Design a protein around this nucleic acid. Sequence first.
RNA 1: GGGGAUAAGCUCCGUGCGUCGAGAGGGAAACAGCCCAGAUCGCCGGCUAAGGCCCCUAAGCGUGUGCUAAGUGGAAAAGGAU
RNA 2: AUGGUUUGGCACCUCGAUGUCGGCUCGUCGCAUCCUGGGGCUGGAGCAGGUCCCAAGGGUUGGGCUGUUCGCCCAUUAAAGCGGCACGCGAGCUGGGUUUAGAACGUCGUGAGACAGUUCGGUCUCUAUCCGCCGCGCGCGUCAGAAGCUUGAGGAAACCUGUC
RNA 3: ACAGGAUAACCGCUGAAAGCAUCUAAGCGGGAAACCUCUUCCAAGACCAGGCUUCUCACCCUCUAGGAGGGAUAAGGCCCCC
Lengths: 214, 146, 176, 37, 23
Amino acid sequence: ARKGILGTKLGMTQVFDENNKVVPVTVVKAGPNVVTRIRTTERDGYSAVQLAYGEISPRKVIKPVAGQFAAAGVNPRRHVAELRLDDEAAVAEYEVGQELTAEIFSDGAYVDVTGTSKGKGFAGTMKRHGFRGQGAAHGAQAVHRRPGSIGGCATPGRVFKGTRMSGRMGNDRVTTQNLKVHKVDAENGVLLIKGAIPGRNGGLVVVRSAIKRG
Amino acid sequence: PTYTPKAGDTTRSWYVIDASDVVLGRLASAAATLLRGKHKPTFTPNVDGGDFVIVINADKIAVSGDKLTKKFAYRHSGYPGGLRKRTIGELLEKHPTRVVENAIIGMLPHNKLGRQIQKKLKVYAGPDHPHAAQQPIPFEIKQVAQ
Amino acid sequence: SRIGKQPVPVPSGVDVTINGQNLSVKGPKGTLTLDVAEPISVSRAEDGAIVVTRPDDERRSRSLHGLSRTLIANLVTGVTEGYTQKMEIFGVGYRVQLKGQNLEFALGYSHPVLIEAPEGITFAVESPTKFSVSGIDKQKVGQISAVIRRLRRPDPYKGKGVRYEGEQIRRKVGKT
Amino acid sequence: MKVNPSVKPICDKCRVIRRHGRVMVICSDPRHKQRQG
Amino acid sequence: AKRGRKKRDRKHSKANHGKRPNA
RNA sequence: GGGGAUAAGCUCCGUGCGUCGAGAGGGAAACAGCCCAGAUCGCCGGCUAAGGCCCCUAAGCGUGUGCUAAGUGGAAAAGGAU
RNA sequence: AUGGUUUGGCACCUCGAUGUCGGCUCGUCGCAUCCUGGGGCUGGAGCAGGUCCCAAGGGUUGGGCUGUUCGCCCAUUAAAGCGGCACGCGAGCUGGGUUUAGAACGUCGUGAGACAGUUCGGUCUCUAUCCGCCGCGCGCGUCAGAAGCUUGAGGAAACCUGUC
RNA sequence: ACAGGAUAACCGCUGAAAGCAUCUAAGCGGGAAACCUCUUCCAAGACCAGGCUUCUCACCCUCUAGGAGGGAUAAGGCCCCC
């Protein structure tokens, strides 16, 4: 009941419509994934499916992983993620081994992707959280970009967890939703998503039919 | 002088209680008595020497008054406005074990020994349990006349 | 008291199963249920009636005795005959019709409104502005009838909405 | 629903009752309807 | 307000016998 | 008893009245002035006061007869109410 | 009767230092609610309303004068909320005001000089030990040592509205 | 977001004590941006320290065999390197 697939971000570009509007489409290469394993309420207590994507030259894989792949019978791959489905409905259409291909979507289909964001390092408040800093003139003694106050005075006398501060933003799993789909290429195994999806070109995405619209 | 239990002294037992419409307070006081060990003559507060307890039919616990729906369990994350509360009915229909647990945990010392006692408390929402290979002794809550 | 002591008449094909306190009444219209509490005893008057009995004359008993009597009276009465409320749609260009079991209104909204028939009742329209609600369980009957009654927010100026057949509503004037 | 700590049977038909731990004055005249609280 | 009242009302306990210091 | 608003943990006087000051220990949830009681040192001895005996907390989910349905108990007024 | 925010009463801790009005930045909390949402009564025809009950999730503008808080005005808005936290926050910023020495006007004083009258000017010190908080590591543990995939207790973020 | 459960004010159905009457005392219902689920994130240091899996899944010498100690290892990881 929830069609998902794994892919690799490449970049972005433009294409045009019949009404001659322009759509900022992001490309994804959902190379044909493989089903390594399965998850059921008898074995594990939930309903899911486990996918695989990429290529390893056979000596870079480890022996536990090679066992996880040769027990299911199939060959090793780089990235192994896991969609979480609902029940036998969404399980009865999957089989161990089978090759998924991008045609499972159709133009107009609304999807939600997930990806690991880009990093920005040790970030201040004015980049994490969008604070008005402070003035640049009129007497400022060295506070041109740092936050301000942080609490009271002898009540509480503490700092109220989730108080917002500097630190590493970026490098987190992120979900981008309700993206339309403009074209599917079967020859090259490519999706032309609309919008603007998370991550750095050359990483890992996971696209799914959207909840609100599927 | 007075007797103090050594290491090779303890003798354990696995008791099992029914919660078939028993009153929560009675049940919990009994379990606290057993776990802490106020029913054996070998009692010493520095030692944990009580008895394991297994509670069943815990989803059959029935209380008095309007406590099912006027009484409010509370929590607090630690964050601001992170006080969140729940009735007792919602909490039974979510997970019944927690009501009886927390009830008992408030009838114990909140010290190191109490934490080391809570290990000796097993609770199950149904009538069953996997601890049959200890042959658990049924306990029937009784009141001694005088 | 004066009601809770009366025995209750019971005509011919009226099978009353006293399974302890739990009571259940069979007649040509159906086999209805009823339950009562532990305190009050349900004796069958063996002249062809049923009689309630209570140990104490305390508050709870005085309250609950008469209730049980009136309930079982309604119960046997329904399974003999039934209940059928009548309702009437006053208005301008308002109207009611039926679609099989389920009923359809025109009440000035921009979409029409319908109702799902519950299990134990049926609707019965006699004219587009006039219908009935025929059932057995008086609780259910008046429930659904009042749910209908509350669709239109009341308007005592011109006399629109739904009316119980003998509803003598109040009225005022907005002259200007 | 006039909410006041003082309610009374204004007219001859206002009946004073008690629902759910609140005193109420029911009457056919909705001007008269009221309760404690 | 609250604080003073709770003081002056804790005094009506049983082990104090109706009286406490600084009320 | 005065001043004050017959308010103040306010201020000023009385009192073979008290305690604290200079006074521990027990009870009061913690709490100099409240209740009990006035510590020569020791004991792995006993009886009691105030207070308290469901578990935390040693001692009674004590006995008997009635009330309470409000979680009153475990803050509160003028007034209202079958 | 409340609440304890207002002008005040007592003078109980602090004068071998508790840094004081307003503004900025940053919050978080209460509801005695400005809008949105549900609702009862009308001297409510309808559109707009008036008053009352429940309700805190979110949001709650930019500008002119004043050091000013408060306020008044302009132009919009769905709406332009009331208050607390050392009248929140100066080891976070300002320093216009007030409250050092200069100077002047009015009034008082014979005079030195003073005014909860005025007027122009006038140094804002500190390398964060501990708690706290945002992030990130080392170590050990979960009855053998390890590698992958993950369930979910429990916590957080988001939650606005308008015009045709 | 859509929808869903239990709800506040509120609207009620059936009905006594109290011959009628009454939303209630026994019961049954509808019902809000608030509440619990749903949405995105974290998370088994969640000490009830989880689960499904896979690989390795086997050596030696001492203290006088007391239980430890001390070596060389597999799977694997780390350091150095790009």
